[PDB]
C-alpha cells in the first residue's frame, strides 16, 4: 500500500516518521510485480462535509467527531454524517481529529441518553486502516523479504504470505549449492540466483497469480541448471519424452524469471546440421 511523506497527520498516529520513510531502501522490479496492490493510506474523504444534518438533534455539522464519557464505560467514537451516525475505530478517530483539526484538538462529549436518539447509518468504507500501531521492522537486522505461494493437492485455494529474515529462507548447510545464473536479459525480468530445495517440481503447468485461479494453460520442463524448456502438448511428444504423467501447478510471476530455451517437439528435432554457428 502507498503512503506519502508529506502527510504528517497519517504518519504520526500510525507510528511512522518523515525521516524514516525518506530513508527507506530500494525494491526490486521482480518483487514489485509479485505483491498484490492494496488501497492507499490517506485521510478518509468524508462526503458533503460541513453542511447541516438531515436528522434532528445532531450534535454538530456533518463530519464532526463525537465521543461518549468514560464514566459510563469504555469510550466509543463516532462520526456524524448527513442522515445519521456511523461508528469509528479508535485509530481512525485519531487520524480524523489530527487531519481535520483546523485548530481543534478534541471531540464533543455527549451522554448516552442523547446519543441513543440518533439513527445509525453506514455510508463510508474504513477497513483499510489497522486497529493498532504498526510494528515496523528495522531493515538493518532483516535485509531480506520474500513473497511465498503454495497450494496443496486437492485444494481449491492457494495461500499467499510474506516472509522476512536476515538471509534467504534456505538451510544454512545448503547455502553453498545455490546456482548463479548468467544474465543476458538486462531488463530486470530475470533472476540472479536459483535454488531447488526439497520436494521441488520438474514438470510444471502455468496458472494465474491470484489465490483462486483454477486454469492450467501450458506445460514446461525445468532443468537442474535453471533453464526452462517448453513441451508441445501432443500425444506423440509426451510419450516420446516419457511425460505421460500429471504436471504440478506453478504461477507465472515466479516461473517467468528463469531463462527460456528452445521448444521440445518431434518436428523440431528431425533436422541435420553440418556444423553449428556461434553468434
Amino acid at each position: 500500500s502507498r503512503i506519502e511523506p508529506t502527510n504528517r497527520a497519517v504518519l504520526l498516529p500510525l507510528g511512522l516518521t518523515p525521516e524514516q520513510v525518506s530513508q527507506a531502501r530500494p525494491m526490486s522490479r521482480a518483487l514489485f510485480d509479485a505483491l498484490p496492490v492494496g488501497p492507499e493510506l490517506l485521510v478518509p474523504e468524508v462526503p458533503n462535509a460541513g453542511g447541516p444534518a438531515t436528522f434532528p438533534g445532531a450534535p454538530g455539522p456533518i463530519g464532526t467527531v463525537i465521543v461518549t464519557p468514560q464514566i459510563s464505560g469504555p469510550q466509543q467514537y463516532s462520526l456524524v454524517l448527513g442522515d445519521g451516525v456511523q461508528t469509528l475505530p479508535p485509530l481512525v478517530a485519531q487520524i480524523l481529529q489530527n487531519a481535520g483539526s483546523a485548530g481543534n484538538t478534541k471531540p464533543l462529549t455527549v451522554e448516552p441518553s442523547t446519543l441513543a436518539k440518533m439513527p445509525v447509518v453506514n455510508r463510508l468504507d474504513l477497513s483499510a486502516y489497522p486497529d493498532n500501531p504498526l510494528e515496523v521492522v528495522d531493515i538493518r537486522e532483516h535485509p531480506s523479504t520474500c513473497w511465498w505461494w503454495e497450494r496443496t493437492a486437492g485444494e481449491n485455494r492457494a495461500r499467499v504470505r510474506v516472509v522476512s529474515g536476515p538471509t534467504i529462507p534456505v538451510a544454512a548447510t545448503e547455502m553453498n549449492k545455490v546456482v548463479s545464473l548468467v544474465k543476458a536479459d538486462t531488463s530486470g525480468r530475470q533472476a540472479d540466483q536459483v535454488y531447488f530445495g526439497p520436494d521441488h517440481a520438474n514438470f510444471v503447468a502455468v496458472t494465474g497469480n491470484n489465490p483462486g485461479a483454477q486454469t492450467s494453460e501450458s506445460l514446461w520442463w525445468v532443468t537442474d541448471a535453471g533453464a526452462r524448456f517448453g513441451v508441445e502438448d501432443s500425444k506423440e511428444a509426451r510419450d516420446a519424452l516419457g511425460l505421460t504423467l500429471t504436471p504440478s501447478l506453478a504461477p507465472w510471476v515466479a516461473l517467468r524469471l528463469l531463462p527460456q530455451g528452445p521448444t521440445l517437439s518431434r518436428a523440431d528435432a528431425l533436422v541435420e546440421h553440418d556444423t553449428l554457428p556461434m553468434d
Partner: protein, 404 residues
Amino acid sequence: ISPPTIDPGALPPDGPPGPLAPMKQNAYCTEVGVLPGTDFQLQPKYMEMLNLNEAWQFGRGDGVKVAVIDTGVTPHPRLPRLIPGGDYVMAGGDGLSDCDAHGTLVASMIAAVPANGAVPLPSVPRRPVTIPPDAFSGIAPGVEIISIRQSSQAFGLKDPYTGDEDPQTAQKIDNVETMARAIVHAANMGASVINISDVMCMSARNVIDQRALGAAVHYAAVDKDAVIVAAAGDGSKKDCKQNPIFDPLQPDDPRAWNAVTTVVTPSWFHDYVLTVGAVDANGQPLSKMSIAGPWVSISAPGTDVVGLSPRDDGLINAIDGPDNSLLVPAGTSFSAAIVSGVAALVRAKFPELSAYQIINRLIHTARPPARGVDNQVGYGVVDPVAALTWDVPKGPAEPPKQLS
C-alpha cells in the same frame, strides 16, 4: 503473400452514413431463447479467469467511449449509456436496431450494468421489429457505447445485376469500401476504443484492392490515437479456411507469411490492429474453430456466453437456428468483446499513454504458450489485474546483445 502496405492519400471523404446502392430486407429477424436448465443466479464460467472482483478496485472505466461497429444494437434498461451513430445498410436507419441477434450480445457483454432493486431508466419506448436476482454484468459498466450498423445477413440489393463482375465477388468490394468509411466516422465521434467483430475472409489468390482501408486504419490509429481491436475470424463463416503454422525447416520467418492461404481483413494490419484468438473456459485453444493466421496477437475466452435479450427484457443463452433446433453461440466474435472491456479499463487508469503503448502493456503481461509466440494464440492469454499493476518497460521488445 507480402505484408500490407499503405498509401495515406486514399482516405475516403467524410459524410453521413448511407449505402452505396438501394437495398431491401429479404428475411425475417432471428428469434432467441434460453437453453434448458440454466440458472442465471450463478456467475458465467468465463468470469473466473478474469478475476473482475479485484480488477474493479481501481474503477469501472468511467468516461470512456467505445465504438461498436457491427449489426447495430437494440436498447434495453441495462444499457443506460447508448448512442446512435449511423447506418450503412438502410438509408433511413441510425444503427439502433439489430435484426440479426449478434449485435446486442456483443455490446451487452462489454457494458451491461449490474442488478439493482430498481432500474435507472424504467421507460421502454423501443419500436417494433421490421418485416419485409441476477449475476450477469459487463466487463466495464462505466463505459459509453456508440452503435454503428455496418453489416447484416437479412438485407439484399433490390437491383441484383452487377455486370462484368461476378455477383459473389462484387459484394466483397462493396464491404471493403463500406468498412473503411465506418472506421473514419467512428474516430471522428471521439471514440477511444473501436471494436470490430465482423470480418471478411478472402483467398490469397488475387486479393481485393484495399488501398482505401489501409489509409483509414492509419488515420484512426495514429492521428486520432484510437485502439483498434478485431476478431481473428470464426472458422464456421462462409469462406474462412484454416492457415498453416510455424515450419522448423525454414527459420527465415518465424510467423510464416510465405505459406498463407486465407487473408482476414482488417485483421491483416498487425502494425495498427490488435487481433484476438479464442480459448475455452479452462484455457485450451479452440483449435477447430479459430483461424490461425500470422497476424494473431492475443487471446481471451469464448464459451458459455450470456447476454441481454433483444426483443425481450431478460437474459438469453441461444439463438433460434435454421431448423427448430436451438443453437448456442461461441467464437472469436465474443473473445474480442472481452478484450475491448480490458482495454477500456486500462486506458482509464493510465490516461497519459498513447495507443501503441497500451497495446504493449497488454501483450507483455499475458501468460504465453509453449513456443513463446504462436499463431493459434498470439503472445498468450489476457490478464486484467496484471495489465493494471505491473511495471512494464516503455520500449518494444528487444533481443540481447550477446548470450555468452
